[PDB]
């Protein structure tokens, strides 16, 4: 891994962490995934957190989250995880995440940020300079 790779993962830890206390439970998984329109089962929640649990205690701190992001589990009928995530952002499915829709996604995840910041983010991912973020640019900022 690298400085920047570890830097993305700190931020992905922070969004699940809800009540603070630097740990993630099966509850924070289930809750944040249901706000993104998913519906986990109690058995499959426990198939995720207790897999990377260690040290006992029942929660996941950042060392654990960090190991998970490298030594992950394998997949089943999955392949296009970038189109599935893109689909979650691009509310009206025209293929272009507007600055407006990015603000909608961040507030549902709990982030209260400046308009200057909302557009700063669009401008980081906007390869062609049209003012919005499309799919072929989303895939590339991932890859």
């Amino acid at each position: 891994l690298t400085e920047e790779q570890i830097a993305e993962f700190k931020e992905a830890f922070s969004l699940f962490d809800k009540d603070g206390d630097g740990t993630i439970t099966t509850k924070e998984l289930g809750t944040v995934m249901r706000s993104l329109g998913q519906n986990p089962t109690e058995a499959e929640l426990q198939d995720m957190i207790n897999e990377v649990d260690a040290d006992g205690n029942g929660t996941i701190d950042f060392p654990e989250f960090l190991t998970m992001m490298a030594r992950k589990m394998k997949d089943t009928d999955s392949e296009e995880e970038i189109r599935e995530a893109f689909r979650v952002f691009d509310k009206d499915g025209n293929g272009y995440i507007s600055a407006a829709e990015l603000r909608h996604v961040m507030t549902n995840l709990g982030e209260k940020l400046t308009d200057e910041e909302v557009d700063e983010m669009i401008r980081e991912a906007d390869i062609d300079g049209d003012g919005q973020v499309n799919y072929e640019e989303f895939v590339q900022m991932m890859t």
Binding site: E8, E11, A12, L15, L36, A85, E111, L113, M121, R123
Partner: peptide
């Protein structure tokens, strides 16, 4: 605040939740 890492962090949390 860091714009490139706020967007990246939220994209990976969405991928993890999906």
């Amino acid at each position: 605040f860091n714009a490139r890492r706020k967007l990246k962090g939220a994209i990976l949390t969405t991928m993890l939740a999906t």
